């Protein structure tokens, strides 16, 4: 419509609106940013490389007083869509990312209300590093964290705040290999820094052990049960060495296969 394009031109007019400047009002105040992580799918956990891949929708909500308008002057329009690349954003990124990809994947539009409220929900494929615990494999439970911070602004310029104490699973696709246990979120300050703030999500996932049970543990038990037969084999048969050497070979091969499955870390066996 003519009114919508007039409004969009008015809001993004570079002469009146600079996207490089924080929308701080009342003086040396801080912009409050609300975060909410929505887990759409747990794509994979790579134990060997210790990387978790997720498909998340990152809700970011703040207020920009410069993106305000009066609905009466604009045909009673209450909200508009603006390209996120043309407005100020709080540069919230996944700080503990592996593969060096900090930002979201798409940069969708931002829904702007007439009162300056901003609602941004970009999607993202994230690769985060996490510490794999190998002791109880394949009956292991993992704890992979996702740390979100602004790599532009410190706590004196913006304040990160959780919208909910947990991550949303409203539109989640079940994994098949991993079971979701808990997805709590926490806002962390530093008592000795005062410029540090982050929001961290703990992904408590639990492996479903059937696949590795059947494909690794039962064969291992079967080979192990053969370790005692050499002592019931008569010496005249002339096949003791064959049996015990074969058992040792199979056991070593299984040891090496397990070594190739788990990460090559030395903290635990």
């Amino acid at each position: 419509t003519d009114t919508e394009e007039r409004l969009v031109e008015h809001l993004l007019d570079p002469s009146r609106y600079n996207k490089l400047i924080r929308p701080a009002t009342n003086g040396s105040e801080l912009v409050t940013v609300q975060l909410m992580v929505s887990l759409a799918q747990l794509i994979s956990v790579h134990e060997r490389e210790q990387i978790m891949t997720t498909n998340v929708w990152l809700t970011q909500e703040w207020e920009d007083y410069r993106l305000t308008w009066k609905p009466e002057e604009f045909d009673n329009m209450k909200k508009v869509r603006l390209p996120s690349k043309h407005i100020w954003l709080p540069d919230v990124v996944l700080y503990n990312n592996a593969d060096g990809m900090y930002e979201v994947s798409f940069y969708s539009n931002a829904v702007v209300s007439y009162d300056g409220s901003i609602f941004w929900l970009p999607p993202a494929i994230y690769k985060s590093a996490c510490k794999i615990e190998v002791k109880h494999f394949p009956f292991d439970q993992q704890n992979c964290t996702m740390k979100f911070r602004s790599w532009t602004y410190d706590r004196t310029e913006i304040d990160l705040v959780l919208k909910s104490e947990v991550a949303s699973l409203d539109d989640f696709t079940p994994s098949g290999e991993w079971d979701i246990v808990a997805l709590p979120g926490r806002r962390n300050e530093n008592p000795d820094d005062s410029t540090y703030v982050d929001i961290t999500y703990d992904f408590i996932i639990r492996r479903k052990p059937l696949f590795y049970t059947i494909n690794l543990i039962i064969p291992c038990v079967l080979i192990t049960s053969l370790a005692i037969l050499v002592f019931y084999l008569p010496s005249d048969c002339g096949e003791k060495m064959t049996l015990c050497i074969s058992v040792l070979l199979a056991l070593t091969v299984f040891l090496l296969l397990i070594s190739k499955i788990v990460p090559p870390t030395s903290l635990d066996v």
Binding site: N18, L20, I21, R22, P23, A24, T25, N26, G27, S28, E29, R66, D91, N96, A98, G100, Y102, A129, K131, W151, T152, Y153, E157, S235, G238, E239, K240, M241, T242, I245, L248, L249, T252, L255, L256, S259, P263, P264, T265, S266, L267, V269
Partner: protein
């Protein structure tokens, strides 16, 4: 009246006649002192076969720009601002011994500019640097991988580097579980290159890293020792059992396989021989 409006006025003023391609000194004989330091986020990989170290570091840089000063009293007490780092002059610090990566920082995060002309820039970088690997005492080996940083086109009389802190920062270090950092210190050096008549400084960081040997112990050493326990058994087997050949052949082939497995880990360098390799080769010969 609002901080945003004052910041807009300040930005209009600062970049009126700013040239980002000119070295930011008031006098041509002045040197730009760049306080340089590294903060390591995580040791991604030590590739022994290809002799490369992959690291994720924050490249802390700090210099003074003489044209980016203002009086906060004139801008609603705005003491500092964040600006895109691509709008200002930046030192061209590059990693000399790059291998399979990038020479310079590529992310180009925003810089923190202070009213007195101080610029702080702390971009992230992933560096893949070459280092000579010595696996004499593998898996109980200690590696010494270096990273040489310095300006590429400005000599010591134009840009000089200052050690922010001799020790590399590990306050936000993500522990690997495979290596431990024994020592990570940066050393300031100057030297002349046949390219150019001037002296080019650099800061070289030496990462002394110790391998945690439990994983390779369990997976290589102990199986090798168990096979080694059986090398002399053939001489106690009676000739009537008809199984001497089976045992000795099995031992030989197992040792050969484990030697081949070790070969796929270590670099194919001819300067040193791993002790494990020598032991396996001598056991195979006997």
């Amino acid at each position: 009246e609002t901080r945003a409006h004052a910041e807009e006025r300040l930005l209009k003023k600062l970049f009126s006649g700013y040239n980002k391609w000119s070295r930011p000194v008031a006098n041509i004989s002045d040197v730009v002192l760049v306080r340089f330091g590294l903060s390591i986020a995580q040791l991604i990989d030590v590739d022994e076969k290809n002799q490369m170290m992959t690291t994720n570091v924050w490249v802390k840089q700090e210099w003074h720009d003489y044209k980016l000063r203002w009086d906060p009293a004139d801008y609603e007490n705005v003491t500092s601002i964040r600006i895109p780092s691509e709008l200002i002059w930046r030192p061209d610090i590059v990693l000399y011994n790059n291998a399979d990566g990038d020479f310079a920082v590529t992310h180009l995060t925003k810089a923190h500019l202070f009213h007195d002309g101080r610029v702080q820039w702390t971009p992230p970088a992933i560096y893949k640097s070459s280092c000579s690997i010595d696996v004499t005492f593998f898996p109980f080996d200690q590696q010494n991988c270096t990273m040489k940083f310095g300006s590429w086109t400005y000599d010591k009389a134009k840009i000089d580097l200052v050690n922010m802190h001799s020790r590399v920062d590990q306050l936000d270090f993500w522990e690997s579980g495979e290596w431990v950092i024994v020592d990570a210190v940066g050393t300031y050096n100057t030297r002349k290159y046949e390219c150019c008549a001037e002296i080019y400084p650099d800061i070289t960081y030496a990462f002394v890293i110790r391998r945690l040997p439990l994983f390779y112990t369990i997976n290589l050493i102990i199986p090798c020792l168990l096979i080694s326990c059986l090398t002399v058994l053939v001489f106690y087997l009676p000739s009537e059992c008809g199984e001497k050949i089976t045992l000795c052949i099995s031992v030989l082939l197992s040792l050969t396989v484990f030697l081949l497995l070790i070969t796929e880990i270590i670099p194919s360098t001819s300067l040193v021989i791993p002790l494990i390799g020598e032991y396996l080769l001598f056991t195979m010969i006997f």
